Amino acid sequence: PLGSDQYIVVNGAPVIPSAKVPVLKKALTSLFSKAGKVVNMEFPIDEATGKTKGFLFVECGSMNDAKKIIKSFHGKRLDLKHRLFLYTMK
Numbered sequence: 001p002l003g004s005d006q007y008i009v010v011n012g013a014p015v016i017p018s019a020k021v022p023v024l025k026k027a028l029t030s031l032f033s034k035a036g037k038v039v040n041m042e043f044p045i046d047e048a049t050g051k052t053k054g055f056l057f058v059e060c061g062s063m064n065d066a067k068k069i070i071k072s073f074h075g076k077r078l079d080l081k082h083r084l085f086l087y088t089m090k
Contacts, residue, residue: 003061003062003063005066005067005088006039006060006061006062006063007057007058007060007066007089008057008058008086008087008088008089009055009056009086009087009088009089010055010056010057010058010085011055011086012078012082012083012084012085013028013054013055013078013082013084014054014082015051015053016052017051017052018045018050018051021043021052025041025043028041028056029041031073032058032069032073034072035068035069035072036065036066036067036069036072037061037062037065038059038060038061038069039059039061040058040059041056041057042057042058043056044056057089066088067088069086074086
């Protein structure tokens with residue numbers, strides 16, 4: 001019912017306003033889905049500025065799904081200014 005080690009932390013992700021999260025979320029999900037199974041993605045928001053904190057959390061539904069995403073996306077360039085870094089959230 002409940003899984004373990006399926007949560008992963010992502011760093012180096014675009015810091016954008018809240019209204020632009022839906023688009024980015026769908027884009028990142030489509031990307032990560034290529035390598036692993038994605039269940040839910042969260043974009044923590046900074047109350048002070050109304051923008052994302054730059055990092056996010058990804059629930060993959062299973063352990064090996066989270067590890068295949070980390071292995072495939074860690075240290076990769078999302079774009080010019082952004083380079084993603086992933087690791088399992090203990």
